[model samples]
Target: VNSFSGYLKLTDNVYIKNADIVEEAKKVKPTVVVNAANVYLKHGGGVAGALNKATNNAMQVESDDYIATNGPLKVGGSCVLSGHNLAKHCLHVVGPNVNKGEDIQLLKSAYENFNQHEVLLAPLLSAGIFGADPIHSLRVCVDTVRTNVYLAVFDKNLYDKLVSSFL
Candidate 1:
C-alpha cells in the first residue's frame, strides 16, 4: 500500500513513516532503536526479535544482565543495551499489554526512561508483538514521545488506520 506522513505539534522534529523498518534502519543512524521488548526477550517475532537476530543475540545477552541486576522489568521498566547491528544502543521495555486492558498511563513513564536521548527509532508498542489495535497505539506513541522520534511502518492496514483517524 502507498504511505503518507506529516509532522505533529508534540514535536516537529518527529517524523512518522510508513515503510520497511529495516530500510529505515539503513537510512538513519539513530541514537537507539527502541523496541517493545518482552522482559525475557524470549519471543521470536516482532521488531525485537528481528533486531535480536540482526545483533546475533546480543539483545538477549543484555537482557540476561538486566534481569540479574534489576530483577524482571515490569511494563514501565526498561533496559538499554549496546546496539550491535543497528543504532548506538537498543532500548528494551515490556510495553503495555493492552489486550489485558493495561492502562498506558505508565506509557508516559516508559517514554521518559529514554528522555535523555535526542533521537530514537521506535515502534508502536503493542501494535505488533502484543497485537493491540495499531492505529490507536500509534497515536498514543506519536503524541506521547517528546523527543525527535523515528518509526517504521510497512503494513497497509496500519497506514490506513492512521489516515482514517486523521480524517
Candidate 2:
C-alpha cells in the first residue's frame, strides 16, 4: 500500500490529508476534533478509539457523561465534549451507516455541525465501519464543511483516489 501524507487544498480553508487524525490534531490544536461516533457515543474503535486512547480515556469518560445526561443520541445528532490531549473539544457525531442504506442527509448534517467551529480536525464521517464509500464521503465532506478544516483520511487507497480525482 502506498501511504499518502501531505495536504491538498479542497476549498478556501479546507484541506485533505492522508494521515492520522490524532497526530495532526495535536499539531494544529483545532477547536475540535470530529468523532465518527455511534448513537450511544461510545469510544469503542476506529477514530473514536484513537481519540480516546490519545486522551487516556478522558474522551470516553466525557462521552459517557454526555450520554448519561443527554441519553442516546439520534442519527445526525451530535454533542461536544472536553478534549484532553488533542483538540480543545471533541464533537461526537452519529453518522448513518450506508450499508443499511442510511440517510445521506445525516452525513451532511454531521458536516454542517462543524460550521460552528473556526478550525477543526475531522475524519470522513460514516466512511469506516459505517460503510460509506470513501470517495462519496469525501465529496460530501468537501461540499459541507465551511470552517478551516483538515480532513484526515486513514486509508491509503482512499487517499490515492481522492488525490487523483480532485487534484
Candidate 3:
C-alpha cells in the first residue's frame, strides 16, 4: 500500500504509520482514537472532518449533543464520545493554536487526559490548519503520551521525518 508501518525501540509500545488516521483506526481497531478537534468540537476540517465523514454523521450528532449540554471545550481540554462506526471511543481534544500564543503545555495537556488508557490511535494534533509545525507537534506528542500509541500521520514528509528521527 506504500504506507510506512513500523515501530521504534522506545519500550516497543509506540507504533507509527504514514497513513490516514481513519483508515488506521479501521485496521487497528483501538478502543479509543483521538480527534484533533476545535474547541467547539464541531468536526469541521482536517482530521475532525475525516472522522466525521467516516462515522456517517453520527459522531457529529454526538458532538452536537455534548456541546449543547457541556459547552465548548477549552484549549487542552478533552471529552469522550462513541466512535460510531470507528473505534470504540473517540477522545475529542482541543489542541492549542500556535498563532494564539498557546504553546506545548496546552498541547501537552490535550494528550495528558488519557494517561490511563491502554491503546490509543491518534493524529498529530495542531499540525494542520491550527498552524503548528508538524515536527514540533510530533515531539510534544512523543514526549507526553503515556499509553501504547499508534500514531497515524498523514504526510510523507512527517512520515519520513519520523523514520529518520525515531527509526
- The segments of candidate 1 whose C-alpha lies over 4 angstroms from its true place after superposition are 1-11, 99-101
**Which candidate number maximizes lDDT?**
2
lDDT tens digits by residue: candidate 1, 27-128: 565667787776565647778777777777877787777778777777776777776667778778667777667665766666666566777777767777
Model-by-model lDDT, in order? 0.67, 0.81, 0.79
Q: Pick out the ten consecutive residues of candidate 2 with the lowest summed lDDT.
A: 1-10
Candidates arranged by TM-score, highest first: 2, 3, 1
Give the per-residue lDDT digits (tens) of candidate 3, residues 1-167.
22225644334565677779888888766789999888888788889999999999889999999999999988998888897778889988889978667775687887786576777888877788778877777777778886777778888787888668752
Clashing pairs in 1: none
Each candidate structure's TM-score, on Cα atoms with residue i matched to residue i, is 0.80, 0.89, 0.88
lDDT of 2: 0.81
lDDT at position 153, candidate 3: 80
In model 3, what lDDT does residue 146 have?
67
lDDT-based ranking: 2, 3, 1
TM-score, predicted candidate 3 vs. hidden true structure: 0.88
The alpha-carbon deviation from the true structure for residue 4 of candidate 1, after best TM-score superposition, in angstroms, is 15
Question: Native-vs-model 1 lDDT?
Answer: 0.67
Q: Of models 1 and 3, which has the larger lDDT? A: 3
Better structure of 1 and 2 per lDDT: 2
Q: Report the lDDT tens digits of candidate 2 across residue range 1-167.
A: 11223778778877888888988887777778889888887788888888889989888788788889889988887888887778778888888978777787788887788888877778988888888877777778778887777789887888888879873
